[PDB]
């Protein structure tokens, strides 16, 4: 819900962007939210 | 940092950015570190230009910085590959844990087995892949 | 196609109208042929047309069959509308009633044809996807597959 709630809308732009800004949006979302994600996998 | 950087690499990275230092104050532009990162044999990716962009007007020495980061990650890479072939001692891709122990025992860190008996227990013969792991954690 | 629009806007509330407003609930697009622009009815066969088009690109033609050598059956009873022009009228309401086809059915080669030819007609939508999306920049469907 966390994730959902801005951090999943901001990856799903990054996706479709595939810009400065974007790649740092894209850092962002890979060393801060999917870490949370891949710790709460199990 | 700069001690991973070898003394003909510094050499040849201050030979390939005198022509950047001698705009007057070493100020290299997004311009000028396309064209070092050119002449350095390889081209830089979007997110090496991100981090000179942070990092940055970028300045020769910080160039310098950035050839003995690259320098430092290609020395990681090497200790990498020494680490996978160095301790298959058997040769065979399975090196005996008693020689990894004898091995660590008698080694430049002066480690203690006793201390390391878990982490190579952990790790009959280990594996090399297994031996890299634990190395690397 | 259109009835069936008008038929399932009336379930919606939404009627003909010639001014279509939000408020109002009337959508002036789902309005008899006859009473619409003829270029609307055009546009709107054109996708029928199309769909021959594709299915003639596929080898597969479709003819209507002649009343030659046919049994008479029996036909049940309908109202039939009168030969004579016939003027829209705004304030009249639409209460349309497509034909319903789910008795008769389709052959199975002709089936999986037209499942080809849908499968066709939906990588020719996401080719439009496509080039809307490289004036936008770009991008990836899961429906394009």
Known sequence: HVLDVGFLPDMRAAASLDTEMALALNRYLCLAVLPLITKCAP | ?137 | ?145
């Open chain 2, 1 to 137: 940092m700069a001690d991973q950087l070898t003394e003909e690499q510094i050499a040849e990275f201050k030979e390939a950015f005198s022509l950047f230092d001698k705009d007057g104050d070493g100020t290299i532009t997004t311009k000028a570190l396309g064209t070092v990162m050119r002449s350095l044999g390889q081209n830089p990716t979007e997110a090496e230009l991100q981090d000179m962009i942070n990092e940055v007007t970028i300045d020769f020495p910080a160039f310098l910085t950035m050839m003995a980061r690259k320098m430092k990650d290609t020395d990681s890479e090497e200790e990498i590959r020494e680490a996978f072939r160095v301790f298959d001692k058997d040769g065979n891709g399975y090196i005996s844990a008693a020689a990894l122990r004898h091995v660590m025992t008698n080694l430049g860190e002066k480690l203690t087995d006793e201390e390391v008996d878990e982490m190579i227990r952990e790790a009959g013969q280990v594996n090399y892949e297994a031996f890299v792991q634990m190395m690397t954690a």
């Open chain 3, 1 to 145: 196609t259109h009835e069936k629009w008008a038929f399932d806007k009336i379930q919606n509330n939404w009627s003909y109208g010639e001014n279509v407003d939000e408020e109002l609930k009337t959508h002036p697009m789902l309005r008899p042929y006859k009473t619409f622009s003829e270029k609307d009815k055009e546009i709107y066969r054109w996708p029928i047309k199309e769909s021959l088009k594709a299915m003639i690109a596929w080898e597969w033609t479709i003819e209507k069959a002649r009343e030659g050598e046919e049994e008479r059956t029996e036909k049940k009873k309908t109202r039939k509308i009168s030969q004579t022009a016939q003027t829209y009228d705004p304030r009249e309401g639409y209460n349309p009633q497509p034909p319903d086809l789910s008795g008769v059915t389709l052959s199975r080669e002709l089936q999986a044809m037209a499942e080809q030819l849908a499968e066709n007609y939906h990588n020719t939508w996401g080719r439009k996807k496509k080039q809307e999306l490289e004036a936008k920049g770009g991008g990836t469907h899961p429906l394009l597959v």
